[PDB]
Amino acid sequence: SSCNVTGVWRNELGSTLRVKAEGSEVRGVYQTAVESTRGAAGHHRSARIIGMVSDGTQPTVSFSVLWEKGSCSAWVGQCFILDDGAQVLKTFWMLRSVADNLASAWGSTRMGEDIFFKT
Amino acid sequence: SCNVTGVWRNELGSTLRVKAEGSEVRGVYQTAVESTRGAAGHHRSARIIGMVSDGTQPTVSFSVLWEKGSCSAWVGQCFILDDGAQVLKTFWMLRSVADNLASAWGSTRMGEDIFFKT
Amino acid sequence: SSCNVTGVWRNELGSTLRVKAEGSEVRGVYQTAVESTRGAAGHHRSARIIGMVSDGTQPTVSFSVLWEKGSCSAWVGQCFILDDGAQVLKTFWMLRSVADNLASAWGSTRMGEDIFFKT
Amino acid sequence: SCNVTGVWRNELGSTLRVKAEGSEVRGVYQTAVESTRGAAGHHRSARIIGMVSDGTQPTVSFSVLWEKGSCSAWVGQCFILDDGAQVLKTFWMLRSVADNLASAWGSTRMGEDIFFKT
Ligand SMILES: O=C(O)CCCC[C@@H]1SC[C@@H]2NC(=O)N[C@@H]21
Ligand SMILES: O=C(O)CCCC[C@@H]1SC[C@@H]2NC(=O)N[C@@H]21
Ligand SMILES: O=C(O)CCCC[C@@H]1SC[C@@H]2NC(=O)N[C@@H]21
Ligand SMILES: O=C(O)CCCC[C@@H]1SC[C@@H]2NC(=O)N[C@@H]21
């Protein structure tokens, strides 16, 4: 019983992650159900993702998103296959907001946990 | 204008060879340090994949898959200091493999990496 | 309707947090269900808490824990009252492992999310 | 030994006055910066409460509650260098007040603070 990163995923915020694994890379499309300020994520709150995925029964993943307005996000996670059979992607993320210069950037990094379930 | 393409070095002694073609970043990462011995394999090198914005002080996000299945990610921004230096200010996460969901709580480390240009 | 920080909470790993407010401070007991390396959290996987709670309806909290073998942890968070009447304590945490020196400390900090519910 | 008790300053210019009592730390933090005008109060100072371990290079964990409801926590270690210099090495989180659960998703920031002595 394997956890397969390829698929369509939904997080606890209601964001959708559509992902295709090929070789050791991932591509696809992230639609965020929220943004940090109006505009940030763009026209349909959507952007391309690019990243890596490991081999194995419970693979690790890492992937990046650049948001239309110049902020950017990164996730690292592992695909686990639960005892009830649900496929689950446990991730932490960083969101990096554009700063004006180095001195004002101390506060430009946010973090959190996204849990993605297959739909 | 700060530019991401080039060869960089961090406070740990690690090296980052980066090349942008537009919004994409590719390259190679050599880490001077490892969480377990050989976790990054014998050359401690891996490929890098990510994104870089446009603008003069662009933001950057990139991932590395390590040889034995851990993976790191960096976000940051390319700054021109007063003195002419180009600096990549980043924060990273290192995700170690875990056996099951229940052991995964302790799987994510973080830190800050300052990359300077060789 | 408010969120009340005082009491016994339980998070996703089964760890129990007992909070007593004394003014702006919080004191109490943390019993972790899990530890890094056997005995890191001491004989009873238990230690005391110290920190702060704000004055809202939905207060923010900050608290810290020194474990027996010297690693330390801190959580920051807010106490939300939900539509269904439930009180959820939403935190993020940092675990600091002891290192021998500055250079080998690069990997000494881990992070996660803890969602506490009231018992 | 590295001694936590004292007056400390970090890369941002913020000042940290702490004293140690058993395994408890107390004192005042004066931040050189804030998220919004006045988040740290008119004087940008607040009390600190936390913990410090025994040993030659002790670990530390402290909190601060800010005037307008946000809060910050630091975890770290007091490393003593070759040159005899004492150095507090930390990572922090800053939680901002949110109106409700759903809109709290982006309410946590982090960073590194490195403190030197006066
Ligand atoms: O606010 C921004 O700068 C762009 C949108 C940010 C979306 C973030 S990425 C991490 C978190 N998880 C989500 O699904 N959305 C938010
Ligand atoms: O430990 C592993 O699982 C593989 C090596 C990780 C190297 C990390 S990546 C974050 C940090 N920055 C560096 O330059 N090296 C370490
Ligand atoms: O591993 C150690 O060094 C001591 C025990 C740490 C337990 C951590 S603290 C954050 C997380 N949440 C819990 O409930 N327990 C773990
Ligand atoms: O913005 C706020 O809500 C309150 C002030 C935050 C000050 C932060 S705490 C982490 C960082 N280190 C400092 O010395 N100052 C900032």
Consecutive H or E run containing B92:
strand B86-95
Give the integer Cα–Cα distance in Å for B82 and C60: 39
Query: Structural domain of residue B64, as residue ranges?
Result: 1-118
Give the integer Cα–Cα distance in Å for B52 and B61: 7
Q: Which two tokens stand for residue C99?
A: 């290192």
Q: Between chain C and chain D, how many beta carbons pairs sit less than 8 Å apart?
A: 132
Give the integer Cα–Cα distance in Å for B112 and C106: 9
Judged by CB atoms closer than 8 Å, whether chains meet at A101 and B57 is answered as yes
* A13, A34, A111: residue with CB nearest D110: A111
Q: Write the burial class of residue D68 (CB in 10 Å: 0-12 exposed, 13-18 middle, 19+ buried).
A: middle
Q: Is residue C114 lining ligand 3, measured as CB closer than 6 Å?
A: yes
Q: Which two tokens stand for residue C4?
A: 């009340």
Give the integer Cα–Cα distance in Å for B93 and A93: 8
Q: Is residue A3 lining ligand 1, measured as CB closer than 6 Å?
A: no
Give the integer Cα–Cα distance in Å for D26 and D5: 9
The answer for residues whose C-beta is within 8 angstroms of residue D2's C-beta and 6 or more apart is D56, D57, D58, D78, D79, D80, D86, D87
- What are all long-range contacts of C34-40, with beta carbons under 8 Å and residues at least 24 apart? C34/B105, C34/B106, C35/C67, C36/B106, C36/C71, C36/C95, C36/C97, C39/C68, C39/C69, C40/C67, C40/C68, C40/C69, C40/C71
Tell me phi and psi for residue D5, to 5 degrees: -50, 130
Burial C20-54 (b: 16+ CB within 10 A, else e): ebeeebbebbbebeebeeeebbeeebebebbbbbb
Q: Do B69 and A56 form a contact (C-beta atoms < 8 A)? A: yes
Place of tokens 């973080």: B110
Q: Do A70 and A98 form a contact (C-beta atoms < 8 A)? A: yes
How many domains would you assign to chain D?
1
Q: Do D46 and D18 form a contact (C-beta atoms < 8 A)? A: no
DSSP string for residues in B31-77: -S--SSTTTT-TT-EEEEEEEE--SSS-EEEEEEE-TTS-EEEEEEE
Judged by CB atoms closer than 8 Å, whether chains meet at B109 and C110 is answered as yes
Dihedral angle, C-alpha B25, B31, B37, B39, nearest 10 °:
0
Q: Is A83 annotated as a binding residue?
A: no
Give the integer Cα–Cα distance in Å for B115 and A39: 30
Closest-approach residue (CA) in chain D for A113: D105
Query: The domain spanning residue B75 has which CATH number?
Result: 2.40.128.30
| Structure-determination technique | X-ray
